[PDB]
Design an enzyme around this catalytic site. Structure first.
Site, PDB file in Angstrom:
ATOM      1  N   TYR A 129       0.822  -1.214   0.000  1.00 33.16           N
ATOM      2  CA  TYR A 129       0.000   0.000   0.000  1.00 33.16           C
ATOM      3  C   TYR A 129       0.862   1.273   0.000  1.00 33.16           C
ATOM      4  O   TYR A 129       0.743   2.147   0.864  1.00 33.16           O
ATOM      5  CB  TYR A 129      -0.984  -0.008   1.173  1.00 33.16           C
ATOM      6  CG  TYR A 129      -1.597  -1.358   1.402  1.00 33.16           C
ATOM      7  CD1 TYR A 129      -1.325  -2.075   2.565  1.00 33.16           C
ATOM      8  CD2 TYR A 129      -2.450  -1.927   0.452  1.00 33.16           C
ATOM      9  CE1 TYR A 129      -1.870  -3.329   2.786  1.00 33.16           C
ATOM     10  CE2 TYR A 129      -3.007  -3.198   0.661  1.00 33.16           C
ATOM     11  CZ  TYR A 129      -2.705  -3.895   1.819  1.00 33.16           C
ATOM     12  OH  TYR A 129      -3.264  -5.156   2.013  1.00 33.16           O
ATOM     13  N   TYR A 131     -12.069  -7.848   7.067  1.00 26.31           N
ATOM     14  CA  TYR A 131     -10.986  -7.856   6.088  1.00 26.31           C
ATOM     15  C   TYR A 131     -10.688  -9.294   5.700  1.00 26.31           C
ATOM     16  O   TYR A 131     -10.534 -10.149   6.583  1.00 26.31           O
ATOM     17  CB  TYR A 131      -9.696  -7.190   6.607  1.00 26.31           C
ATOM     18  CG  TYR A 131      -8.594  -7.289   5.561  1.00 26.31           C
ATOM     19  CD1 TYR A 131      -8.621  -6.481   4.406  1.00 26.31           C
ATOM     20  CD2 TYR A 131      -7.570  -8.231   5.690  1.00 26.31           C
ATOM     21  CE1 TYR A 131      -7.646  -6.581   3.434  1.00 26.31           C
ATOM     22  CE2 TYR A 131      -6.579  -8.355   4.711  1.00 26.31           C
ATOM     23  CZ  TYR A 131      -6.614  -7.526   3.576  1.00 26.31           C
ATOM     24  OH  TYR A 131      -5.619  -7.655   2.588  1.00 26.31           O
ATOM     25  N   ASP A 139     -12.762 -17.211   8.714  1.00 24.89           N
ATOM     26  CA  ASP A 139     -11.452 -16.765   8.250  1.00 24.89           C
ATOM     27  C   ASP A 139     -10.547 -16.590   9.465  1.00 24.89           C
ATOM     28  O   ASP A 139     -10.545 -15.526  10.100  1.00 24.89           O
ATOM     29  CB  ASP A 139     -11.582 -15.470   7.438  1.00 24.89           C
ATOM     30  CG  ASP A 139     -10.231 -14.953   6.938  1.00 24.89           C
ATOM     31  OD1 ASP A 139      -9.196 -15.544   7.323  1.00 24.89           O
ATOM     32  OD2 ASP A 139     -10.210 -13.975   6.131  1.00 24.89           O
ATOM     33  N   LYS A 192      -0.670 -17.376   7.300  1.00 22.81           N
ATOM     34  CA  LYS A 192       0.247 -16.547   8.159  1.00 22.81           C
ATOM     35  C   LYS A 192       1.025 -17.429   9.096  1.00 22.81           C
ATOM     36  O   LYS A 192       2.077 -17.934   8.698  1.00 22.81           O
ATOM     37  CB  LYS A 192      -0.496 -15.383   8.903  1.00 22.81           C
ATOM     38  CG  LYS A 192      -1.003 -14.349   7.895  1.00 22.81           C
ATOM     39  CD  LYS A 192      -1.541 -13.065   8.582  1.00 22.81           C
ATOM     40  CE  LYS A 192      -1.823 -11.916   7.561  1.00 22.81           C
ATOM     41  NZ  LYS A 192      -3.267 -11.823   7.314  1.00 22.81           N
TER      42      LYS A 192
END
Lengths: 431, 431
Positions: free
Chosen positions: A19, A146, A247, A276
């Site tokens: 980003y 998210y 998630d 992750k």
């Protein structure tokens, strides 16, 4: 390895970071090595890592068991294709994941990254209803959530955060219930629970699945909500036949204090996404698990198969280092280490709540969040943190800590002390 | 590492492989190790690899330079986050990619997998027009193409292959021109070129970019088309201001006989996607490069940045093994090795064209394709190939070879001889 003055200018001029702007990027810091819970900069300064490289490095860096497991698998084969082939690292990893996850989950789809794992779960939900002859194309979720950066995942991300205004004309239209965090400090707003159930009942024949991040909403705001939400959503889904996708790419493998955040509510999703910390944060890998019922159903449609298959699927090297990481968790130490981190974070972040720059301090497991009343000045704060010998990467109105589980007491004290100092300094906030 | 009888049953019962059914999966073969150009099965049989693990393993397996570069980077750090941080492997990799790619390409976005790299390119094209105040949301491409399995990429995949019938109601609607391969053996159909230009001119204010796989269309049919297509599409795009995305995730790093298949036409795309052989097929990594103009433009919109950032972005270990792989290509040997493979494939596959089961034999670089008149019986053929001591993984109506560049003559002869035998055996085809 060493970086020249010219190397660092080339990075600034040519290399995107997450980003960032290519025309006016913020400075970055040159890291040569990492050991234990410390990053080592060019010139030798050591920084206590407060971020675990964004969740994943739960065992810190250069861990001897993770290193040895990688080099051993390299000697056998780092990679072979998974089409028509299986191998020992993938089998052991999938045995471990089935054994440790909530009980209905039996079938494992290995993939490359967390975003792809979510896409896979969404495709599974859509193929499921296709095999049952219903046209279900909508997903129901929370605001503030998210799920990744690819287009499918973006369409269940919060419709103000991901700037949906730009992709809304391209992005599929989903259903967004009130955010679960209570509005004024309580455990939950029953009104928000009632509003979720109304939206579901109103679209119950169009909704393929509910998707959510259990207990902690990460990149969407580091928000923490009550487990009653999960038990009630699970009941609603059961009553309608709708699938529940959990998630856990951020929450999985112990970070909230339980191995999987679903355990806080004692519920099992139909589809569970992991990533992750799966590899100990050494390299990318993801996994999407499903029930037997889901896998057989998506084997019954007009597809004849589940319509997905990354080139590096099942990568032996990443599987082998995930196995070593999971074997470290089998000591059970993580559960105690995370509880002690939680207690230290709660005690040491509490003084920050007195600051006029601060709106809330909240802690769960090895996650400590200071929500500020104004956006942070990222460049100024990053310089401050590095000057203090720590690595903390804030964003928006959030200064937060998610350190490796093995962090030492004085290392964690340096992190919380730096955060307390940062929120007293007006220069560290923008307008 | 060893696999028990029970391990192999657990794989069958619990572990998805690419595009498989969980209820009736085809058998898979247990691989313990890989060395040079051979896979080694449980029990010790060695198979000549005809597939390079789907394009990527261009230097074969267990390569000593790739192994050493991985272990060296593990000793420094396998991973650290890229947000606010840079490191020597990412800098060297991005220097190498800028230096070796067509000249306007200057800015590199590192990512995890080929599908994500395509999503990134598509997002870049959309942000580009958003910064210029135009609402461009459509992509123009060829039929027969393939770009990945995530939802964004699926929407530029061929509308019959990826079974768009199921996702068409969820998937964004794009523009699909005639497939570029000539209809009856010629170099190109000018009519197909004229039809492409008509579709573009008809939607020229809605089209954000053209996306295509240059010269070879891979998973969509192993189709090979003339470079005049690329020079003409590049001219059309230039005339309209439309961006050209080249997807070289399969063709990049020498496989068609040039380092990048775009070089066949002498054109430069605005955005170039790379993957697969990038790491020598040791582990997953991708990269999307852009021109300076694109990167500054997508730094100018209302986003303030390019809105993408995988957790494992810039992974030092994968960058370090990509650097070693690129250093192997700097010998220049690949170009000669691939030309000699091409000549052997053309000579040795030609007898197959006489078979009634065969519709076409076509070769480019180190890609040899036998297109059959009926779908293959994958299970029966896989058993045959393994019995012959080779690894060849056909699909649909395609039996094809893409071996490592270092393959030895007798190893490649065993592959072509096996393919010639396979197409004479009616039992190896279905109905």
């Amino acid at each position: 390895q060493g970086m020249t003055t010219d190397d660092l200018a080339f990075d600034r001029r040519h290399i995107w970071h997450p980003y960032t702007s290519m025309t006016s990027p913020l400075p970055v810091f040159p890291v040569e090595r990492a050991e234990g819970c410390e990053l080592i900069l060019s010139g030798g300064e050591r920084l206590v890592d407060g971020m675990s490289s964004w969740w994943a490095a739960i065992h810190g860096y250069n861990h001897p068991q993770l290193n040895a497991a990688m080099k051993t698998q390299i000697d056998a084969m780092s990679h072979v294709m998974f089409g028509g082939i299986t191998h020992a690292p993938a089998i052991e990893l999938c045995r471990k994941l089935v054994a440790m996850t909530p009980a209905p989950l039996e079938c494992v789809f290995l993939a490359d990254s967390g975003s792809v794992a979510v896409e896979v779960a969404m495709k599974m939900a859509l193929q499921y209803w296709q095999a049952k002859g219903e046209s279900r194309q909508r997903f129901l979720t929370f605001r503030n959530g998210y799920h990744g950066d690819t287009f499918g995942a973006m369409s269940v991300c919060d419709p103000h955060n991901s700037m949906h205004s730009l992709w809304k004309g391209y992005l599929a239209e989903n259903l967004f219930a009130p955010a679960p965090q209570s509005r004024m400090g309580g455990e939950w707003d029953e009104r928000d629970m009632v509003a979720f159930a109304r939206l579901m009942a109103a679209h119950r024949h169009e909704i393929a699945a509910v998707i959510l991040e259990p207990i902690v909403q990460g990149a969407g705001g580091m928000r923490i909500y009550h487990p009653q939400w999960l038990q009630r959503i699970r009941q609603m889904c059961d009553r309608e036949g709708i699938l529940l996708i959990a998630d856990e790419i951020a929450t999985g493998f112990g970070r909230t204090g339980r191995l999987f955040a679903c355990e806080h509510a004692g519920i099992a999703p139909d589809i569970l996404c992991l990533g992750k910390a799966l590899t100990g944060g050494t390299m990318t890998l993801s996994a999407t698990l499903t029930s037997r019922q889901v896998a057989e159903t998506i084997s019954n449609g007009e597809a004849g198969c589940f319509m997905h298959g990354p080139t590096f699927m099942g990568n032996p090297l990443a599987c082998a280092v995930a196995n070593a990481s999971l074997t470290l968790l089998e000591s059970g130490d993580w559960r105690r280490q995370v509880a002690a981190i939680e207690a230290q974070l709660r005690e040491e972040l509490a003084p920050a709540a007195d600051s006029p720059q601060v709106a809330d301090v909240r802690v769960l497991g090895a996650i400590g969040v200071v929500e500020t009343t104004r956006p942070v000045n990222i460049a100024a704060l990053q310089q401050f943190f590095v000057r203090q010998g720590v690595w903390v990467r804030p964003f928006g109105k959030l200064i937060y800590l998610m350190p490796p589980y093995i962090i030492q007491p004085e290392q964690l004290r340096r992190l919380t002390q730096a955060v307390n100092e940062a929120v007293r300094e007006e220069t560290f906030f923008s307008v």
